[PDB]
Amino acid sequence: GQLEDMAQRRKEAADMLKALQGASQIIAEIRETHLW
Amino acid sequence: GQLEDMAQRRKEAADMLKALQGASQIIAEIRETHLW
């Protein structure tokens, strides 16, 4: 009848997901370099 | 399901070999009258 710390932590955790994207970009660059 | 420098070098070598072979064939095909 009647009825910020966590937000920052989850935001940092989500931002840490960029490691996979960075690894994929590095792998793609290495593959492109191997061609030359 | 799924499966440059060296390529350029081999292409140049093949082109040079083909040019030499063509030149040799052209020289051989010259009329015997002009070759002797």
Side-chain angles (χ1 to χ4, degrees):
Chain A
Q2 301 181 5
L3 304 182
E4 299 295 349
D5 300 330
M6 183 279 299
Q8 295 294 352
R9 188 175 64 87
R10 64 176 182 179
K11 184 178 181 299
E12 292 178 0
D15 299 330
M16 286 178 180
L17 183 58
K18 298 180 180 180
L20 303 178
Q21 300 180 0
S24 63
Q25 293 293 354
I26 294 167
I27 293 169
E29 291 180 4
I30 294 169
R31 290 288 299 180
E32 292 178 0
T33 297
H34 289 353
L35 302 177
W36 174 264
Chain B
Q2 298 180 0
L3 307 179
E4 299 180 1
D5 300 330
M6 300 294 84
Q8 181 63 10
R9 286 302 321 280
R10 63 181 61 180
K11 184 264 287 182
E12 291 179 0
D15 298 0
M16 294 171 184
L17 181 61
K18 181 174 64 58
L20 292 178
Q21 291 178 0
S24 180
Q25 291 178 0
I26 292 167
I27 293 169
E29 289 177 0
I30 298 175
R31 300 179 181 179
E32 300 295 349
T33 59
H34 297 268
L35 294 175
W36 298 94

